[PDB]
Amino acid sequence: PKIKTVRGAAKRFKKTGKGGFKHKHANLRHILTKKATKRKRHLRPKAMVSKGDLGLVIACLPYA
Amino acid sequence: GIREKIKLVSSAGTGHFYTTTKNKRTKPEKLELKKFDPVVRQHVIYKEAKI
Amino acid sequence: GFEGGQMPLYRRLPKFGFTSRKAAITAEIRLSDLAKVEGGVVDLNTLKAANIIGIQIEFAKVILAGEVTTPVTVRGLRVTKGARAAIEAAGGKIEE
Amino acid sequence: TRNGRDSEAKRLGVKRFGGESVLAGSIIVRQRGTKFHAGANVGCGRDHTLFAKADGKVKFEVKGPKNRKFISIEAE
RNA sequence: CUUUAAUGUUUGAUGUUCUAACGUUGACCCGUAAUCCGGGUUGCGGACAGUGUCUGGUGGGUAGUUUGACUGGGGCGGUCUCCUCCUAAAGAGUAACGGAGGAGCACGAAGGUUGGCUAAUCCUGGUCGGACAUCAGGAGGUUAGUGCAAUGGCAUAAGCCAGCUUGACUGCGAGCGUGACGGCGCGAGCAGGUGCGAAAGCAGGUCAUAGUGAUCCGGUGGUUCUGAAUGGAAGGGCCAUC
RNA sequence: AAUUCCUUGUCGGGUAAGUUCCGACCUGCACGAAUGGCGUAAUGAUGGCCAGGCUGUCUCCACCCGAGACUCAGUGAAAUUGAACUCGCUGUGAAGAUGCAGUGUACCCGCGGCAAGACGGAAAGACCCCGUGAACCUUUACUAUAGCUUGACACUGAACA
RNA sequence: GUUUAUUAAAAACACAGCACUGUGCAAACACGAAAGUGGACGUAUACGGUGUGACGCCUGCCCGGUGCCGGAAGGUUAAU
RNA sequence: AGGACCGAACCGACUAAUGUUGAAAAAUUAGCGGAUGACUUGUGGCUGGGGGUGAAAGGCCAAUCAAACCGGGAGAUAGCU
RNA sequence: UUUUGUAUAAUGGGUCAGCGACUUAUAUUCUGUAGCAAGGUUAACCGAAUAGGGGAGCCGAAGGGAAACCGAGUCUUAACU
RNA sequence: CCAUAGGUUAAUGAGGCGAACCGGGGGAACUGAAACAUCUAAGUACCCCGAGGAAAAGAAAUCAACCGAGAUUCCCCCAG
Secondary structure, eight states: OOOOOOHHHHTTOEEOTTSOEEEOOSSOSSOOTTSOHHHHHHHSSOEEOOGGGSHHHHHHOTTO | OOOEEEEEEESSSSOOEEEEEEOTTTOOSOOEEEEEETTTTEEEEEEEEEO | OOOTTSOOHHHHSOOOOOOOSSSTTBOOEESTTSTTSSSSEEOHHHHHHTTSSOTTOOBOEEESOSOOOSOOEEESOEEOHHHHHHHHHTTOEEEO | OOOOOOOOOOOOEESSOTTOEEOTTOEEEEOSSOSEEEOTTEEEOSSOOEEESSSEEEEEEEETTTTEEEEEEEOO
């Protein structure tokens, strides 16, 4: 049959122009008062996925 | 430890806050600071409140 | 995405965003795809006739990709500056 | 209590050596205190990390009363 | 208003009676040749008992499961994240149930800036005053101090004391370092708007290195986003935060 | 002591000599009163100890009678088996050698016997550990649940305080 | 007397007797979604459960813990 | 008279030797316990698998029992060989 | 065969003959190869039935943003050197 | 007492067997989740009842979106 997308992955990655994947950064949901502004500011923009974890995300998102 | 969290809230009625800690036993009296409100884009008084 | 039972990457990271229902019923038209209509007037119903957009589509936009030769009267669609300029310089007409 | 414990290695030390050409921003030495101090075109960070403020070749030297090791720079 | 009364009033629940539901494994009559069943007559119970739906308590009576790893075999003991020194072979990194110690916080000042200042210890004299307390002088040279381990720093003090204050700002960030990745760290400089200083300037917390916890779920505030026929709203997103 | 670790406790008895037995002592590691205490005639294919009788149990075996063994005739299995031209010693070596090195010994093949070796045969160790294996058992482990109990609404009505 | 048919016959199980406890009869209890059946064509000198185990002499102290029994004033508490 | 005594049949199974690819998937020889009883035996019947039955050993339920046998789910699953 | 390592006295095989283990379907990615090329290709079904019809669809020629929205740009920010 | 239950005869009908397919009533666990209880396996296996050459479903108190479509059934897309 058809391949089924891993639906977790779908809600956390999104495909770009040259085929990479953007993702929200971890560490910004709570326990914030202590984190320094700088730390929190640098986490806010979305990030691309590293070269050694694209295999793990192309598997989960084969219709992406 | 005995070192609780608090909002400082802007006195311009944007609900912008900073959050910080305070020892409640050793200092009871309420914390009042000038800080930058980024919505109006000025420095302003900020007062204590509950987190 | 099993990493031997380390927390796997699609679960370390946050979920983000929501799916807009309005985007499923939007299109983009290229300029290259305005020769291909049969009329030289460009409604939504004229584009569906020529199999350039789908049956479910309520909105479109004409964007600047490709050239255009003739005068072509656009109607009820949106258009980007980069385009509007290139429709009108070719002799054409936009009327909302 | 017995033993069993140590921390993770903090990968301090000199990174760029004298001669080596750098770009402004480049860290030159991580360090706990000021084994080295900042001379010309060099910032003491807040953890006393020393970094280029200009492009050029790194120069070490000694200076002053106490014979302290300064990292400075020759902007090319 | 307080307190209290009979006027009327809606439900309550606590008795005591009753009989008509319901019970009868009381007696007799019939179907019938039958200790079943049913029907009748007559007693005794009687809205109780008992059965349904909902609900609290109990429930190894029964069922499904769980009950960690390292480990000079396992068990018992000990450990499991983080910081400092040594082991570590003069860059980095580097193991052992190798050798030593710490942390799971504190501080609206113990942060910022301008100005000023320089320690421990011992000796001599001096009311109560003694080995030890405030005073004076001399020697001494950081043997001191640095909120807390250790190490590296520190007089231009990063140590100590005063004045004024909130840069313990918001948006960003060339470029470096460090990680398998998640991530963690340093950062000149640009814009907005502050503080100190006459000014050059300095300030995006603390001499540095511990003081911590991914995602999911949910909560609180805000919002030019969304809103399943349309207008709202609910919910969802984004920002702040628990 | 069906209970006492120290323990062959100490003392007495029994034996030439008694870690057992019998009687005591009490220092009961850690007896004890219906998960019964202390006693008890009779009973016991029940445990321990002693004595008489009897004995090849033994000193220490000998001889004899039968059944197999052995030979001949007839019938005719089995476990096992990588291949074999299948010696000893010392050394070596995945660490206990018929098979390697060095050396010694040995004409070729049977039959009766013995069992030291072939880490002989019979069995994918039962002991130990591991598996995010299984089962069954326990409980004040977790979550349920049959059952037993509580109340509310229903079947369920009347009158009078 | 009984017992591990096929490595255990015993000091194990049973036993007469003792004690506690439940049960008023449509009994407790047991088997059955229920009807029903056993208990028993018995009725407390009877029946079920538990422990001890002829007989003789006996059977001491503790109700804090855990069960069971009783008590209802007050607290806490479900559906409704 | 007697869950009395001795002891054949009958029921059992304490000791030894043999047997251990047996004569036999539990026997044989020599001795051994009960033997009018809580005895023994024939024929037929009832109880069914988390169920039965058990003077209780986790014993027995067709040479199988801390959960029978036959078929099915089923090519269960096997980070192991 | 398994191993750091086997003549091993670790595993397995008495011998011979026969049978005995990387398959199939449907998706998806990359390479090779053929066709056509800013286009490529049809599915069910129809049908003189491996033709021809059928372009419903699918992939591509545009991306950014959570989204509205904008678009060779866009997001971030009051604003970007 | 009248009735009613009951009883006797007559006429007509059913019962059982059988591959799969179909509709309904009951309904697992192994397994996956690298443990496990929500969840999965699966409304599958199996048990039971009923019907026919087919069965079931079926002519909107249906969708749609301010334009419109016009009962059920089956195939390809929509779409992992």
